Ligand binder design. Structure first.
Ligand SMILES: Nc1ncnc2c1ncn2[C@@H]1O[C@H](COP(=O)(O)OP(=O)(O)OP(=O)(O)O)[C@@H](O)[C@H]1O
Ligand SMILES: Nc1ncnc2c1ncn2[C@@H]1O[C@H](COP(=O)(O)OP(=O)(O)OP(=O)(O)O)[C@@H](O)[C@H]1O
Lengths: 350, 49, 82, 199, 73, 342
């Protein structure tokens, strides 16, 4: 039966089996096999697995003793495959409209609509945007928008931190670039997101060789693999920073990165929805006016709205009061915002 | 087989033999790098808000 | 006097060795703080990196809720303002 | 004896390694090509005068005896720096610097031929000549002219050939380049763009 | 002339005209003018070198070129 | 089990480790081999091989017990490799036409006038400009051959493997006629012999010397044309600034006004627009730009053609495309808002 011949192939397999990289097809079914250290006898292949699945120079299943080619490889999994491949569409498409409302449309019709409906480009002959940078003040919504398009997705979403690629072994970074874009290739049209790559410029590290000539090579592999060859087709890639100065302009140049999208701090019309929805789930003495908080602070982030709208509940619930007086918003905003440069030292502005 | 949990591997034929319940990183060297016990509140005096 | 819930790893001691050297994504500490879910983390270019992985975990993606990460320094706060 | 000693060289290829130093408390320190150290108080089948520290030697895998000296110490880049072609340039090409040809020959060519011209008078030979001017006036012409016309092993040297990112001493390429050239080129050495390193 | 020794040179060449109307050339530029006479003579596909092409090399794209006749009138 | 029985007869047959040759001794085979990592070796042969073809820079079969030489093979074999807009920047394809076209066509301009064929050009210019356009625009007229090599592909951890790829390339260029191998990032390839008694980055160096040998000198080019892309003629080699090698140095920065109108034609016909509009106003609006940026302008007018339902692109879609890209996309969205001039 097939269990007997299958067990015979299993007995061709000697239980310590190794994993080694091919170099070249030697066409007459005896091959020559590199290990990680490359001890390469003229070994043969177990001739029931398909030899013609693999290109030359691809990893296989081997033996220790005779080193004979036994089986086919499956994948490569690192601590990054767990993190690069996002498992679920996590959460938070939006809990509050009124965050930005401007570049929401821009990321929507720039990223979502060419992806979700790629038939407009037939009508007009337009290429899709390949690289878009999302950058500005810290904690604007950029990471939150990455989790938005992560949740409101249509693709195999990929989440990458830019500092994941930093190793001490030689070539290890570009190897994880190759596994990286292999992941970016072989699922479906996937949304790659890469964040905090403004912290790859003036950066020197401990677990490292010669610093100026290590990550130059890895980022060089990013420049070659990212938007050089290997036909983009439909592979969405979105990166994000906070600053711009350490950016090598060789990737900033078009072809590679197409759209550079800033982020302002929100205006008072959009503030009211963030103030309101951050207060949508709390007991509040509604006689107080949020418009003092909406008017007063001029360059708030939404974390300032968050911190005040939690902090006033820390001041009312500090004394077991379910609803919040206006002076708890006073101590709230004066507790959040510190070192208000108004008078004292110079205050030349008066 | 738990993913990324470590095992006791024999050197015999590399027979996958036992599974080791363990923590992975330097956890010992700095995982438990606390200052353990000390004293009480009485020697503070003033920053009570 | 919180009986389990304060594991002051002190987070800056050999700073060019306890941080990033061996523990790149210093999240080894975060695996400590999760698998010792009563804990409190304390601290005093790599600092920017590990800073960013702090911000990769503690920006709304958190298991035992907040732990208590604390840094302390003095006299001017002109560390990198991200 | 020598049947089994040919056998010791024959066992495997008898791992060519490096001598680190040599003491005489006759005694030598081996670094394998596996980068592993093995002191021996007994050298074996060669003489300590024949070798020196920093050599490629054949060592038994088993006895760890210094078996033979390799005839493969060829020295990368230098032995490639020795110009073996020797392109021709007679002095008909040098137009306008004929007095510099004369002081050139009196300075350089005659110390190669006749030191009795110097030391029957009994002082010294000359020591080093500087060529300078605009860079199209011709500084290669003395190199190829003295290469072909004066029958000696023309050796060349460039300026940026003394700067490698990887550091640790300036005494390997230099000292094994001239200590290289003490035998198979001890008459002609052309340094070029010395102003690129003379800072 | 050492550069134009092996090249096919028409006898309608006065080297003293050429090198006399040269000002401030090194032999890097003697070679540059002579090989650029080979290349300017090589553009139209002449059978040999021509004295005009030597004279054209004499002014290989006006050294630094530019030639704005603004302010010089 | 298609062939399981013979596999149980192949188990008494297992030999021949990888074992790249270093060099040889004299009068005798007496070869010398490093394996990969372990050590270096003064080897001897199994007697049933050919002692001729154990030449240097090769890997033979080698036993495990005696390390005796079994048969070699060349390592790197068969899998290596996979223009109406001829005319962009103007005077570049004329000099390219000279140095490339004239040895491929006439040894009448050269030998009858008494010169050597100009065989290479050092291309220098900013990226995103058309080195790809010019070099692949050569491939219209040779026959149809073009090979594309990035220098940074050769960053490996094996001695002379880049130089082994120099062997592979200079033994593939001679197989076919009128072929084009492209060179790029030639600063990491090296022109200056950086060296100090430490011995680090030298696969670059020996690969560069193998590049000198197989490039020019030692069987001249013929029907092989190779250009070199750089930003700098600075870190080069005087052995390759040997003037029979690379003597033209074609220059290019930007199109003037009307090359930009030509690229307006190129990226205009390549998309759905309206044919009732002009582009010289846009070439006025583009002082300093690449044609890739022109393509970004045309796709941005495509974006306004997405917003409104447009397939015949008006002038104003391009007007807001340029006012987007050059003005509302220079740094932020405000380079103007002061009159003071008009
Ligand atoms: N409805 C809203 N309108 C405007 N801004 C908002 C709104 N909701 C949240 N924000 C802001 O956007 C940010 C969302 O989290 P974000 O990912 O920006 O934090 P972060 O991780 O610090 O970002 P970064 O790492 O880029 O600095 C919050 O800091 C908040 O201030
Ligand atoms: N002078 C030009 N004429 C026509 N199109 C041009 C011109 N300059 C730029 N382009 C356009 O911009 C693109 C620039 O990309 P290209 O294919 O040349 O790669 P590249 O980056 O320019 O090559 P390289 O960076 O090694 O010079 C061209 O493909 C073309 O669409």
């Amino acid at each position: 039966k097939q269990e007997e011949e299958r067990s015979k192939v299993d007995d061709l397999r000697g239980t310590p089996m190794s994993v080694g990289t091919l170099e070249e097809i030697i066409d007459d079914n005896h091959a020559i096999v590199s290990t990680s250290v490359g001890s390469e006898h003229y070994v043969s292949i177990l001739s029931f697995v398909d030899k013609d699945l693999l290109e030359p120079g691809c990893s296989v299943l081997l033996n220790h003793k005779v080193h004979a080619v036994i089986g086919v490889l499956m994948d490569d999994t690192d601590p990054l495959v767990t993190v690069m491949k996002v498992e679920k569409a996590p959460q938070e498409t939006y809990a509050d409209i009124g965050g930005l409302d401007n570049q929401i449309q821009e990321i929507k019709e720039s990223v979502e609509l060419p992806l979700t409906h790629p038939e407009y480009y037939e009508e007009m002959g337009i290429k899709p945007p390949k690289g878009v940078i999302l950058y500005g003040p810290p904690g604007t919504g950029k990471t939150l928008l990455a989790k938005a398009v992560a949740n409101q997705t249509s693709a195999t979403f990929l989440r990458v931190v830019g500092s994941e690629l930093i190793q001490k072994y030689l070539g290890d970074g570009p190897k994880l670039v190759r596994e990286l874009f292999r992941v970016a290739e072989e699922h479906a049209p996937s949304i790659v997101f890469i964040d905090e790559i403004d912290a790859i410029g003036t950066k020197r590290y401990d677990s490292n060789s010669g610093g100026e000539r290590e990550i130059q090579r890895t980022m060089l592999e990013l420049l070659n693999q990212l938007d050089g060859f290997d036909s983009r087709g439909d592979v969405k890639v979105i990166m994000a920073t906070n600053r711009i100065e350490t950016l090598d302009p060789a990737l900033i140049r078009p072809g590679r990165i197409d759209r550079k999208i800033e982020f302002p701090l929100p205006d008072e019309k959009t503030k009211k929805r963030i103030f309101q929805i951050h207060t949508s789930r709390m007991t509040l003495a509604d006689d107080v006016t949020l418009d003092d908080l909406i008017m007063a602070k001029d360059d708030l982030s939404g974390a300032d709205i968050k911190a005040i709208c939690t902090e006033a509940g820390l001041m009312a619930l500090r004394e077991r009061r379910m609803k919040v007086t206006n002076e708890d918003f006073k101590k709230s905003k004066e507790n959040v915002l510190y070192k208000k440069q108004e008078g004292t030292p110079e205050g030349l502005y008066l | 087989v738990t993913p990324n949990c470590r095992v006791a591997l024999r050197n015999d034929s590399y027979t996958l033999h036992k599974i080791l319940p363990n923590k992975v990183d330097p956890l010992v060297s700095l995982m438990m790098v606390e200052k353990v016990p000390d004293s009480t509140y009485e020697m503070i005096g003033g920053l009570d808000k | 006097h919180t009986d389990c819930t304060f594991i002051r790893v002190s987070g800056s001691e050999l700073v060019q060795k306890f941080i990033g050297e061996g523990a790149r994504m210093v999240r080894e500490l975060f695996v400590m703080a999760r698998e010792h879910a009563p804990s409190i983390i304390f601290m005093d270019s790599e600092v920017q990196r590990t800073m960013l992985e702090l911000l990769n975990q503690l920006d709304g993606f958190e298991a035992t809720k907040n732990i208590k990460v604390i840094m302390a320094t003095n006299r001017i706060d002109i560390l990198d303002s991200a | 004896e020598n049947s089994e000693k040919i056998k010791v060289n024959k066992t495997l290829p008898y791992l060519v390694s490096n001598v680190i130093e040599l003491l005489d408390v006759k005694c030598a320190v081996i670094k394998t090509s596996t980068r592993q150290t093995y002191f021996l108080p007994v050298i074996g089948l060669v003489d300590a005068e024949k070798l020196k520290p920093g050599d490629l030697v054949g060592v038994n895998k088993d006895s760890y005896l210094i078996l033979e000296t390799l005839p493969t110490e060829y020295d990368s880049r230098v032995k490639a720096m020795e110009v073996d072609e020797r392109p021709t340039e007679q002095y008909s090409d040098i137009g306008g610097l004929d007095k510099q040809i004369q002081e050139l020959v009196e300075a350089i060519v005659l110390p190669m031929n006749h030191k009795e011209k110097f030391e029957n008078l009994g002082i010294q030979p000359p020591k080093g000549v500087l060529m300078y001017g605009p860079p199209g006036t011709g500084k290669t012409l003395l190199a190829r002219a003295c290469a072909a016309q004066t029958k000696a092993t023309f050796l060349k040297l460039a300026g940026p050939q003394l700067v490698q990112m990887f550091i640790g001493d300036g005494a390997k390429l230099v000292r094994d380049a001239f200590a290289l050239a003490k035998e198979k080129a001890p008459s002609i050495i052309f340094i070029d763009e010395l102003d690129a390193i003379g800072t | 002339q050492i550069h134009s020794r092996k090249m096919n040179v028409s006898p309608d060449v006065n080297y003293e005209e050429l090198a006399r109307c040269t000002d401030d050339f090194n032999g890097a530029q003697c070679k540059a003018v002579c090989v650029e006479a080979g290349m300017i003579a090589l553009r139209r596909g002449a059978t040999e070198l021509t004295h005009e092409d030597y004279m054209e090399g004499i002014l290989e794209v006006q050294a630094k070129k530019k030639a704005n006749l603004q302010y010089y009138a | 089990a298609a062939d399981k029985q013979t596999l149980q007869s192949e188990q008494p047959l297992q030999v021949a480790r990888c074992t790249k040759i270093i060099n040889a001794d004299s009068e005798d085979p007496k070869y010398i081999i490093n394996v990969k990592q372990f050590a270096k070796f003064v080897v001897d042969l199994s007697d049933q091989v050919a002692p001729t073809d154990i030449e240097e820079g090769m890997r033979v079969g080698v036993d495990r017990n005696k390390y005796q030489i079994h048969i070699p093979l060349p390592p790197k074999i068969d899998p290596t490799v996979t223009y109406s807009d001829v005319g962009g920047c103007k005077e570049q394809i004329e000099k390219l036409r000279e140095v490339v076209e004239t040895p491929l066509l006439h040894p009448e301009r050269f030998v009858n006038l008494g010169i050597e064929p100009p065989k290479g050009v050092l291309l220098f210019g900013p990226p995103g400009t058309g080195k790809t356009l010019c070099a692949r625009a050569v491939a219209n007229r040779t026959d149809a051959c073009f090979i594309r090599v990035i220098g940074s592909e050769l960053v490996q951890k094996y001695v002379g493997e880049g130089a082994r790829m120099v062997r592979e390339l200079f033994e593939m260029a001679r197989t076919k006629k009128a072929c084009l191998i492209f060179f790029d990032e030639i600063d990491a390839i090296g022109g200056a012999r950086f060296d100090d008694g430490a011995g680090g980055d030298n696969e670059v160096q020996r690969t560069m010397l193998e590049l000198i040998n197989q490039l020019d000198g030692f069987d001249p080019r013929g029907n092989i044309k190779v250009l070199m892309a750089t930003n700098r003629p600075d870190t080069l080699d005087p052995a390759l600034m040997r003037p029979g090698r690379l003597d033209r140095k074609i220059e290019f920065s930007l199109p003037d006004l009307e090359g930009r109108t030509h690229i307006f034609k190129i990226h205009a016909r390549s998309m759905s627009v309206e044919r009732d509009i002009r582009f010289e106003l846009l070439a006025r609006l583009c002082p300093n730009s690449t044609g890739a940026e022109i393509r970004s302008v045309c796709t941005e007018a495509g974006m306004f053609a997405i917003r409104a339902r447009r397939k015949i692109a008006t002038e104003k879609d391009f007007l807001e495309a340029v006012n987007k890209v050059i003005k509302s996309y220079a740094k932020f969205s405000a380079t103007p808002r002061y009159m003071t001039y008009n």
